[PDB]
């Protein structure tokens, strides 16, 4: 694992890592090859180039509480020159609209968020996939939350 010399990573969340989004490389159909590395939980670029970056996250809950919580998912670039950080891809999601079924009955809600796009990156740039409310993640099943990149 694996032929193709194009730097790649498709990484997946740690379910047994409560309270945060941790990316596991050592699993299933997870990738991490040709110079790409996973380090302070960030994907690290081995070469100047064009890269497709994607991530999906899946939030869940049962019923609605305090008027509003908003879920967000972003991919940041932190750069070797620009020692600072910027969003390449973002998205906010609002599940249950205050509803608060205070009559009764609490239903399952699920809210996925997909981020994808092509960016030019420099050797040693660090990519970061973050969310605001890690405790609303679904850690129960396979292809549900993940973070990938590939050189073109």
């Amino acid at each position, epitope marked *: 694992r694996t032929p193709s010399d194009k730097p790649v990573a498709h990484v997946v969340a740690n*379910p*047994q890592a*409560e309270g945060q989004l941790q990316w596991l490389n050592d699993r299933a159909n997870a990738l991490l090859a040709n110079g790409v590395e996973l380090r302070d939980n960030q994907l690290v670029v081995p070469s100047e180039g064009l890269y497709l970056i994607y991530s999906q996250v899946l939030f869940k*809950g*049962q*019923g609605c509480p305090s008027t509003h919580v908003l879920l967000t998912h972003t991919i940041s670039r932190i750069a070797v020159s620009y020692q600072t950080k910027v969003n390449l891809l973002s998205a906010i999601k609002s599940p249950c609209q205050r509803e608060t079924p205070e009559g*009764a*009955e*609490a239903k*399952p809600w699920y809210e996925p968020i997909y981020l994808g796009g092509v960016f030019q990156l420099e050797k040693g740039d660090r990519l970061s996939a973050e969310i605001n409310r890690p*405790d609303y993640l*679904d*850690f*129960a*099943e*396979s*292809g549900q939350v993940y973070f990938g990149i590939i050189a073109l």
Partner: antibody
Amino acid sequence: EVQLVESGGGLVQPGRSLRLSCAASGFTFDDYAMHWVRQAPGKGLEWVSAITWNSGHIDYADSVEGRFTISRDNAKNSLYLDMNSLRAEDTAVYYCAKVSYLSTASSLDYWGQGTLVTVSS
Amino acid sequence: DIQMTQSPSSLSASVGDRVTITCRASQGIRNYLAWYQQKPGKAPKLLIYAASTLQSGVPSRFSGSGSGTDFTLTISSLQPEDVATYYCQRYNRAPYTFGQGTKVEIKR
């Protein structure tokens, strides 16, 4: 209405093996994850494994993984558990349970009547 | 990991008396907790899911509460048929582990 009919239980020499069955009816079986839950005699309830609607994900217990194999025929509306290399600790009544809402991570909304499996020479 | 711990392990009570069973999780599980009733030899039945939502067709004297780690099954007026063993269950997240159980018994 919803029925989960177990079969496959019985006596078995330790080291040998068994294929439990659970025949579902009264609900579109294809839309639900299923669970196996065992209960050793006098002991309490203990989750065993689970399988999603399309069989794409499977979980087992900090206690098996290598020995048991949950499976599912949707045409036959059936849930299977193939147990291998059996020891006395596997001796228990085994329940199949239909989940409440789709995902494996949902409440066990309906159970079969059980089927006892006695491991003994 | 995860420990589902229900107290007490056993309780006797008077018909009509209100009964309280508690469940503490060793790590938060939001409201991904259900209560199951199991009568002697019978298959267990789901009473509450999402901590507080009664299953349809389940008498309303049964109630639940709690989010996070501490949960409470309550029978507001114990009844002769309520004699059973009750189990809480985690469902987030596998493994879907059950508390050790709580036997319920009566006055007369």
